[PDB]
Structure 1
Amino acid sequence: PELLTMWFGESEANVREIFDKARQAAPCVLFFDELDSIAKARGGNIGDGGGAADRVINQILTEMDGMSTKKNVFIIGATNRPDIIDPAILRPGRLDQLIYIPLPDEKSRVAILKANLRKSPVAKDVDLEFL
Structure 2
Amino acid sequence: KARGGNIGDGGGAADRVINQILTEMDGMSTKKNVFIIGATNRPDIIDPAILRPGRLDQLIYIPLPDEKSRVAILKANLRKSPVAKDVDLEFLAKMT
CA distance in 2, matches of 1:92, 1:78: 17
Match of 2:14 among 53, 69, 93: 53
* Deviation of the 1:126 alpha carbon: 1.3
Distance 1:75-1:47 versus aligned 2 partners, 3 A rule: same
Distance 1:56 1:71, change over 3 A: same
In structure 2, list runs of 5 or more residues that go unmatched. Answer: none
Name the TM-score, length of structure 2 as normaliser. Answer: 0.78
- Structure with bigger strand share is 1
Q: Which secondary structure does the structure 2 equivalent of 1:61 belong to?
A: helix
What is the CA-CA distance between 1:47 and the residue it aligns to?
6.7
Deviation (angstroms), 1:68: 3.6
Stretches of structure 1 lacking an aligned partner (at least 5 in a row): 1-39
The alpha-carbon distance between structure 1 residues 45 and 67, as it changes in their structure 2 partners (threshold 3 A), is closer
Using the aligned pairs only, state the percent identity: 100
1:84 and 2:45 aligned: yes
State the Cα RMSD in Å: 2.7
CA distance in 1: counterparts of 2:14 and 2:47, whole angstroms = 11
Closer, same or farther in 2 for the Cα pair 1:111/1:42, shift >3 Å?
Answer: same
Count of matched residue positions in the alignment of Structure 1 and Structure 2: 92
The normalised TM-score by structure 1 is 0.59
Please give the alpha-carbon distance, in whole angstroms, between the structure 1 residues aligned to 2:57 and 2:13. 24
* SS of 2:9 mapped into structure 1: coil
* Whole-angstrom distance in 1 between the partners of 2:81 and 2:70: 20
